[PDB]
Amino acid sequence: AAQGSAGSMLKPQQTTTRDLISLDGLWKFALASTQPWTSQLKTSLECPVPASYNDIFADSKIHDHVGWVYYQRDVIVPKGWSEERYLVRCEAATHHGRIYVNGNLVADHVGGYTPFEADITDLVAAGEQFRLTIAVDNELTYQTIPPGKVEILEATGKKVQTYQHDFYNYAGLARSVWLYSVPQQHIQDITVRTDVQGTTGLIDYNVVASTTQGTIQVAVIDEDGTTVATSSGSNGTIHIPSVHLWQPGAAYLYQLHASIIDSSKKTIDTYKLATGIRTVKVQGTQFLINDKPFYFTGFGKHEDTNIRGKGHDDAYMVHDFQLLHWMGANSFRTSHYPYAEEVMEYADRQGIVVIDETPAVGLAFSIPATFSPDRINNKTREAHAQAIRELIHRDKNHPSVVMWSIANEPASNEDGAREYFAPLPKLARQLDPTRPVTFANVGLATYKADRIADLFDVLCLNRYFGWYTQTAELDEAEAALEEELRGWTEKYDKPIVMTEYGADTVAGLHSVMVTPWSEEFQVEMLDMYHRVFDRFEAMAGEQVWNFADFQTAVGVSRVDGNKKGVFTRDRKPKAAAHLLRKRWTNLH
Amino acid sequence: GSMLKPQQTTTRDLISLDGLWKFALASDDNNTQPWTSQLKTSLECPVPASYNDIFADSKIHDHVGWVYYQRDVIVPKGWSEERYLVRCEAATHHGRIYVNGNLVADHVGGYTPFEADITDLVAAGEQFRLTIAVDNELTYQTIPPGKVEILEATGKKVQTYQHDFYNYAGLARSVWLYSVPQQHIQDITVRTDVQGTTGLIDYNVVASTTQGTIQVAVIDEDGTTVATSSGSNGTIHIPSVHLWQPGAAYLYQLHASIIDSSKKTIDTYKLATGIRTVKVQGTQFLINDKPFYFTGFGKHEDTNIRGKGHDDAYMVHDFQLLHWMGANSFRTSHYPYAEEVMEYADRQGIVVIDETPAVGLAFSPATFSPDRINNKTREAHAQAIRELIHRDKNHPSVVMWSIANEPASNEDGAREYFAPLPKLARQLDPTRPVTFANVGLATYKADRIADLFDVLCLNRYFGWYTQTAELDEAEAALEEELRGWTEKYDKPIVMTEYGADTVAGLHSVMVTPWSEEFQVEMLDMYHRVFDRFEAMAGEQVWNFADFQTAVGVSRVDGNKKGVFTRDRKPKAAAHLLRKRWTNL
């Protein structure tokens, strides 16, 4: 883990040449008390892996814990492995993960939403058994990339985790853990850039191999199963005659088979990696996927379900996606962190557009000046960029991912904000020149007051007039909102997307009168917002906040988390769901 | 036709096949044999789950008949010289495994494993297309029984059945590819006895071939081996044993290895056992020779979207909620649950009543005849006992088998039907008492099955059905029945189920059903009566949590008799229970 760079490999898969093993299951679990990774574990406490631990146990001490926790289990390297290089991966640690093989530290990793792994091949032998213990610290600071500070309670002395975001600070191994193998000479990375000449579809590729052994073949197969182009070399471009384009309601995916042939006509490594072929351009006030203009519809979302909290779930993913299709949503935004990788591949097959967001949420203090040597400084920017790299490295390939979101609701109206943010969108366009760049702008940072927006390609606005400013005054709110829309459309020649608009709603709370927290009120606000968007020709999309009720930090104005959900936390449609379905399916 | 739960050792390997499978349901195309081609679906269905609620699509949820799960599988290169097979922890009722178009297994239990040795069908290091066909149709001969019918006007197929809960279908439990040595261990058996302070156990391993020798280590929780033995089976004493107790789980690990001509280990298996005895004497249920009282619930394999699908987190949380409220037991309501739950219960010190999938042997027409439930049905019923007991025999947590829930034990034919069944059970496993859960109509007068069973499991719901909202009246009808049974039979009585429906948030200070308060009052008044009867052996409230059911004008989006909500939140009764169960 180095400054200015990203060292993950490709998403482990199984092949004729590589082997894959799941470490998911229950693991022994305990709380920081000393040096637990040097002996076995002493607990009847077992925690499921793909999951956040906080809610799992029905224990207050555990849920409330500030610091490190310890997952542990034994592992056996299959005896079939020697002559194969093998290693241990975490798709994500809560925030700060550490990997111990038997009681030597083998990896330390600061991102909370991106993979990390350790090559253990010289460290254990094929056929041998070791003690995998993984340490996850949930502590946020001013330098950690969702920012925060631990404090202490004057009377009881209890440790307490402050932060500036909405959603609860769920910790642990939220994403699958793996033990896999790769041949000594292997493909480590692949870069795919899809473009279109007339009707001919060309993808520039780039394959990275552990050594300089043999050569690099690439077959490119269609959905039916018949290869449609081939190539040699670590890099080039591939021509596809009469391409089936990946379309935002009509996913087409070709399968790029990268192989590492040895001296002779023999395959020694291979890797299957799906791409779809699509361009993304912003021209002025317009968002083009495949040179036709596009309008987002959908939600910012969360990784949040009932007991597992943030832990990725196969069936909620599929269900969630069906609800999107049910209502004719075409996109969503990975809200305030990168989601599980498997959600991105699913999004690709599913033909859903994604706004991929770094875990930079709450870069402000006004939910004290936020950009200084105290709160958000240069060491913080360093971590912010560190996170931009790992996200892009990981996600660069998904045709569904369509624009990077640098941050949520940063204090972009304050002195200091511009210096801070300047290198970040520039980093993004550099590492990946194919997609546009944005961040979701807060209400305070008005068109006048914001000093960041010009550095970005698309304008993403979060607004809540009918909620905060004009509380229940929908007409006075329609005033405020078009005031603001005008301001942006006049000052800038970018396209605009409402990334956040909504109102807390308690399922079953009804009222014939104007009343916030009533299914009815939610409808009305949503509806008048829509009416306003349609009168602005500069709008390029709309994302309700949020998909579904979700858990947040304890708070008096938070009714057991955030209820701005259009669906309940158990995924049941409020009235708003049906409004959105009616608008999204019945017009363009 | 099963084998020990696959596990990774030094000599066995093991891959999970869980994840997104291409999913499609059977239509009446030209394509009558979908298992020999790529599926036309662009639907991916998650595996550990069950499919009905997953797709937000009616036709899918409503479907009667076959569906197909399909995916590609790579047998590892290193697997050769080794023996490998594909296991299904469970299907919906009827599962068929196809390996490259080839029918390789066909299995009729709904909640137990089935598997296929495919070592000669696919080459190690090669890829194959695995497709699994699961049929959800019940009949008079399936183990939950029921008939399929046709809606007169529209023509739509519909599935009738007799039991409460919804008929969630699919691959509700994990799928595996796994390696095993040519000369492998196939089954193990453990029987734990207590002889004063010393624990004894009789191991019985069954390997594939008879060369080399069988060796056994028994390691304590601290890593130190504590008795050793040689031979395909023998009996072990453990000096000052650490007993598995309902309050305090303790699990010795039994390593059974298959030594060869030399001093090398060709195969090996790790099998957890707890040392504990179950005796029923008189009206008493004794665990390790002290009186025991079941506290807890009938439960269900039911969560929100995955339906019946096994779930690690809800598992762990559920148990944490038993601990929270001082529960000590539960009943695998109306089907054996997933294997790993039973394992977990072992580690957790939670006692289990293991029930077969046999509910709804009741048509309230005459239910026991050559039409509804005949010998053929009874064949299948004995098969489930075989497969249930074969799989679960080893668990210190499992403490009783439950033959069936709420059968018409009061009708003619009932007796001829059940007779062979508990005999079968006691023959397959002498170490545990046998029961079934008695329905309300089958009173202590009317019932004609009960004498044939070790423990009496009942599920009275007077305050609900009978003296609906008349608790004083229900109290009487309740104690009347308990006099009856305790007067008539010299056995332990456990209220297997009991309690009233309740809507979270619905409240009242008076006697009003469907209010949180009414539930507390019913549950309570029952406990008052249980405490007066010396023959009582345990109480299990009817239900851990709300669960989905067959659609009904009397079922508010499922059953709400649950003590927690479907997303597992405490109702008023949860607290009443916690108070009683922790404190005395």
Dist CA A151 CA A148 (whole Å): 10
Q: Closest to A315 (Cβ–Cβ): which among B305, B320, B323?
A: B305
Distances (CA, A) of A213 to A17, A207, A262, B230, B505: 15, 13, 6, 52, 68
Dist CA A547 CA B454 (whole Å): 53
CATH label of the domain that carries residue A214: 2.60.40.10
Contact between chains at A44 and B347 (C-beta distance less than 8 A) = yes
Dist CA B480 CA B492 (whole Å): 17
Residue with tokens 């000599």: B11
Dist CA B582 CA B178 (whole Å): 43
Dist CA A544 CA A301 (whole Å): 9
Sheet of A267-275, strands arranged across: A227-232, A215-221, A254-261, A267-275
Q: Closest to A46 (Cβ–Cβ): which among B9, B46, B316?
A: B316
Q: Which of B259, B277, B295 is the C-terminal boundary of a domain?
A: B277
Dist CA A567 CA A545 (whole Å): 11
Dist CA A438 CA A422 (whole Å): 12
Amino acid letter, residue A187: I
- State the maximum Cα–Cα separation within chain A, in Å, rounded to a whole number: 78
Torsion of the alpha carbons at A564, A346, A441 and A284, rounded to the nearest 10: -130
Dist CA B303 CA B316 (whole Å): 13
Dist CA A410 CA B214 (whole Å): 67
Structure tokens at B576: 């009443």
Contact between chains at B55 and A318 (C-beta distance less than 8 A) = yes
Distant-in-sequence contacts of A509-518, Cβ < 8 A, 24+ apart: A514/A472, A514/A474, A515/A472, A516/A467, A516/A471, A516/A472, A517/A563
Dist CA A205 CA B569 (whole Å): 51
In 3-state terms, what secondary structure has residue B500? Answer: coil
Dist CA B469 CA B474 (whole Å): 8
Amino acid letter, residue A5: S
Helices of type H across B412-554:
414-418, 420-428, 471-488, 516-530
CA B11 to the chain's CA centroid: 30
Contact between chains at B316 and A26 (C-beta distance less than 8 A) = yes
Contact between chains at A56 and B13 (C-beta distance less than 8 A) = no
Termini Cα distance of chain B: 45
Q: A328 at the B interface (CB within 8 A)?
A: no
Structure tokens at A346: 């699913």
- In order, the DSSP letters of B522-579 are HHHHHHHHHTT-TTEEEEEES-SB-B-BS-BTTBSSSB---SB-TT--B-HHHHHHHH
Dist CA B418 CA B368 (whole Å): 10
For A50, what's the count of Cα atoms within 13 Å in the CB-facing half-sphere?
Answer: 19
Cross-strand pairs, A271 = A258
The answer to the question of whether A166 is labelled as a binding residue is yes
Question: Phi then psi for A91, rounded to 5 degrees?
Answer: -60, -35
The verdict on A147 and A217 lying in the same domain is: no
Dist CA B167 CA B357 (whole Å): 12
Q: Provide the residue count of chain A.
A: 588
Chain A hits for B51, CB-CB cut-off 8 Å, are none
Dist CA A197 CA A200 (whole Å): 5
Residue with tokens 């069906």: A322
Pick from A150, A94, A104: nearest CA to A124? A104
The 10 Å Cβ neighbour count of residue B127 is 14
Q: Closest to B320 (Cβ–Cβ): which among A57, A76, A311?
A: A57
In 3-state terms, what secondary structure has residue B73? Answer: strand
Resolution in A: 3.1
Q: Is A500 a catalytic residue?
A: yes
Name which of B18, B317, B325 to mutate to probe chain A: the one with the most chain A Cβ atoms within 10 A of its Cβ.
Answer: B317
Q: Which helix (H) or strand (E) holds A178?
A: strand A177-183
Q: Closest to A307 (Cβ–Cβ): which among B45, B55, B568?
A: B568
Structure tokens at B53: 């609620």
The verdict on B332 and B345 lying in the same domain is: yes
Q: Å from B137 to nearest chain A CA?
A: 24
Structure tokens at B525: 């008044």
Torsion of the alpha carbons at A273, A274, A277 and A283, rounded to the nearest 10: -80
Dist CA B536 CA A272 (whole Å): 63
Cα-based angle A524, A525, A528 (whole degrees, multiple of 5): 85
Pick from A37, A11, A14, A9: nearest CA to A119? A9
Pick from B573, B446, B579: nearest CA to B503? B573
> What residues contact residue B56 under an 8 Å CB cut-off, 6+ apart?
A319, A322, A323, A326
Amino acid letter, residue B60: I
Structure tokens at B540: 């299990």
Torsion-angle region of B360 (φ positive above 0: left; ψ -120 to 50: alpha; else: beta): left
CB A421 within 8 A of CB A480: no
CA-CA-CA-CA torsion sign (A224, A226, A228, A233): positive
The 10 Å Cβ neighbour count of residue B150 is 11
Question: Phi then psi for A36, rounded to 5 degrees?
Answer: -65, -15
- State the maximum Cα–Cα separation within chain B, in Å, rounded to a whole number: 78
Q: Which structural domain, as residue segments, surrounds residue B246?
A: 182-277
The verdict on A177 and A305 lying in the same domain is: no
Q: Which of A183, A211, A244 is the C-terminal boundary of a domain?
A: A183
Dist CA B335 CA B143 (whole Å): 10
Structure tokens at B227: 């008795």
The answer to the question of whether A529 is labelled as a binding residue is no
Contact between chains at A315 and B54 (C-beta distance less than 8 A) = yes
Dist CA B334 CA B406 (whole Å): 10
Per-residue buried b or exposed e for B556-567, using 16+ beta carbons within 10 Å of the residue's own CB? eebbbbbbbbbb
Sheet of A129-137, strands arranged across: A46-48, A26-31, A68-76, A129-137, A96-101, A104-109
> What residues contact residue A287 under an 8 Å CB cut-off, 6+ apart?
A280, A293, A294, A295, A296, A436, A458, A495, A540, A541
Distances (CA, A) of B130 to B36, B116, B304: 10, 12, 28
Pick from A304, A354, A359: nearest CA to A331? A354
| DSSP-assigned letter for residue B59 | H
Chain B hits for A50, CB-CB cut-off 8 Å, are 312
> What residues contact residue A378 under an 8 Å CB cut-off, 6+ apart?
none
Structure tokens at B302: 């039911």
Structure tokens at A105: 């530290």
Dist CA B504 CA B561 (whole Å): 10
Q: Which of A247, A279, A311 is the C-terminal boundary of a domain?
A: A279
Do the bridges between strand A292-293 and strand A401-408 make them parallel or antiparallel, or are there none, so unpaired? unpaired
Q: Provide the residue count of chain B.
A: 584
CB A361 within 8 A of CB A302: no
> What residues contact residue A582 under an 8 Å CB cut-off, 6+ apart?
none
| DSSP-assigned letter for residue A522 | H
- In order, the DSSP letters of B247-315 are TB---EEEEEEEE-SSS-EEEEEEEEE----EEEETTEEEETTEE--EEEEE--S--SSSTT---HHHH
Q: A250 at the B interface (CB within 8 A)?
A: no
CA A487 to the chain's CA centroid: 31
Q: Which helix (H) or strand (E) holds A89?
A: strand A84-90
Q: A486 at the B interface (CB within 8 A)?
A: no
Dist CA B177 CA B15 (whole Å): 5
CB B492 within 8 A of CB B450: no
CB A134 within 8 A of CB A71: yes
The verdict on B289 and B256 lying in the same domain is: no
Do the bridges between strand B43-46 and strand A287-289 make them parallel or antiparallel, or are there none, so unpaired? unpaired
CB A71 within 8 A of CB A64: no
Residue with tokens 């690439």: A218
Residue with tokens 């001093």: B263
Contact between chains at B566 and A570 (C-beta distance less than 8 A) = yes
> What residues contact residue B154 under an 8 Å CB cut-off, 6+ apart?
none
Dist CA A276 CA A510 (whole Å): 45
CB B111 within 8 A of CB B142: no
Structural gaps in chain A: residues followed by a C–N separation over 2.5 Å: 33, 367
Report the binding-site residues of B for alpha-D-glucuronate.
Answer: 164, 461, 465, 555, 559, 561
The verdict on B192 and B160 lying in the same domain is: no
Q: A321 at the B interface (CB within 8 A)?
A: no
The verdict on A77 and A195 lying in the same domain is: no
Q: Which helix (H) or strand (E) holds A512?
A: none
- In order, the DSSP letters of A397-441 are T-SSEEEEEEEES--TTSTTHHHHHTHHHHHHHHH-TTS-EEEEE
Pick from A116, A117, A163: nearest CA to A139? A163
Q: Å from B459 to nearest chain A CA?
A: 29
The verdict on A214 and A190 lying in the same domain is: yes
Of A84, A117, A303, A409, the active-site residue reads A409
Pick from B170, B200, B3, B2: nearest CA to B95? B170
Residues 513-542 of B with CB under 8 A from A: none
The verdict on A242 and A309 lying in the same domain is: no
Instruction: Give burial (CB, 10 Å; 0-12/13-18/19+) of B215.
Output: middle
The verdict on A172 and A47 lying in the same domain is: yes
The verdict on B238 and B134 lying in the same domain is: no
| Residues of B with catalytic function | 406, 497
Dist CA A315 CA B20 (whole Å): 9
| Helix A341-350 with A314-327: angle, nearest 10 deg | 30
Dist CA B313 CA A56 (whole Å): 7
Q: B208 at the A interface (CB within 8 A)?
A: no
Give the method used.
Answer: X-ray
The answer to the question of whether A558 is labelled as a binding residue is yes
Q: B33 at the A interface (CB within 8 A)?
A: no
Pick from B424, B430, B425: nearest CA to B280? B430
Per-residue buried b or exposed e for B100-117, using 16+ beta carbons within 10 Å of the residue's own CB? beeebbebbbbbbbbbbe
Contact between chains at A318 and B54 (C-beta distance less than 8 A) = yes
Dist CA A489 CA A497 (whole Å): 11
Question: Phi then psi for B381, rounded to 5 degrees?
Answer: -65, -40
Name which of A77, A306, A344 to mutate to probe chain B: the one with the most chain B Cβ atoms within 10 A of its Cβ.
Answer: A306
> What residues contact residue B468 under an 8 Å CB cut-off, 6+ apart?
B513
CB B188 within 8 A of CB B201: no
Structure tokens at B476: 């009487």
In 3-state terms, what secondary structure has residue A133? Answer: strand
Structure tokens at B42: 């662009």
Q: In chain A, how many domains are there?
A: 3
Dist CA B365 CA B162 (whole Å): 13
Contact between chains at A307 and B314 (C-beta distance less than 8 A) = yes
Q: A–B: how many Cβ contacts below 8 A?
A: 119
| Helix A423-431 with A378-395: angle, nearest 10 deg | 20
The verdict on A284 and A273 lying in the same domain is: no
> What residues contact residue B60 under an 8 Å CB cut-off, 6+ apart?
B25, B51, B52, B54
The verdict on A318 and A415 lying in the same domain is: yes
Instruction: Give burial (CB, 10 Å; 0-12/13-18/19+) of A179.
Output: buried
Dist CA B214 CA B256 (whole Å): 7
Pick from A171, A105, A98: nearest CA to A139? A171
CB A359 within 8 A of CB A306: no
CB A42 within 8 A of CB A133: no
Structure tokens at A113: 């939403």
CA A72 to the chain's CA centroid: 27
CATH label of the domain that carries residue B49: 2.60.120.260
| DSSP-assigned letter for residue A278 | -
Dist CA A266 CA A261 (whole Å): 5
Structure tokens at A406: 């640098």
CB A402 within 8 A of CB A289: yes
| DSSP-assigned letter for residue B342 | H
Dist CA B127 CA B74 (whole Å): 4
Q: B483 at the A interface (CB within 8 A)?
A: no
Dist CA A111 CA A96 (whole Å): 7
Distances (CA, A) of B531 to B331, B479, B535: 21, 11, 9
Pick from A300, A291, A289, A232: nearest CA to A261? A232
> What residues contact residue B343 under an 8 Å CB cut-off, 6+ apart?
B272, B395
Q: How do the residues of chain A divide into helix, strand and coil, expressed in percent and rounded to 5?
A: 20, 35, 50
